[PDB]
């Protein structure tokens, strides 16, 4: 069983090394792609969506000075 565990560890490094290398490439490509996609207007649109998502609004000149929930 000790020998089998040694073989398991030998096979474990390669699997984790492959994932690290694969993850690095995806992040690297995902980085040079954002150099174009993240213009100020795109960031503004994403800001609109994120701020307005799942939000309640109490707008009006004479907002009351009370609240309970």
């Amino acid at each position: 069983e000790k020998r089998i565990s040694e073989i398991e560890d030998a096979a474990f490094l390669a699997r984790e090394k492959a994932k690290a290398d694969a993850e690095y490439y995806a992040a690297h490509k995902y980085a040079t792609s954002n150099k174009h996609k993240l213009t100020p207007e795109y960031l503004e649109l994403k800001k609109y969506q994120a701020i307005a998502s799942n939000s309640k609004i109490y707008f009006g000149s004479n907002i009351p000075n009370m609240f309970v929930d």
């Binding site: 701020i51 799942n54 939000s55 609004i57 109490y58 707008f59 009006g60 907002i63």
Partner: peptide
């Protein structure tokens, strides 16, 4: 995250 807003008008929501 759940949010609530208070302000004079809608456009002020996105201003920072």
């Amino acid at each position: 995250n759940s949010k609530i807003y208070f302000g004079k008008d809608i456009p002020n929501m996105f201003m920072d």
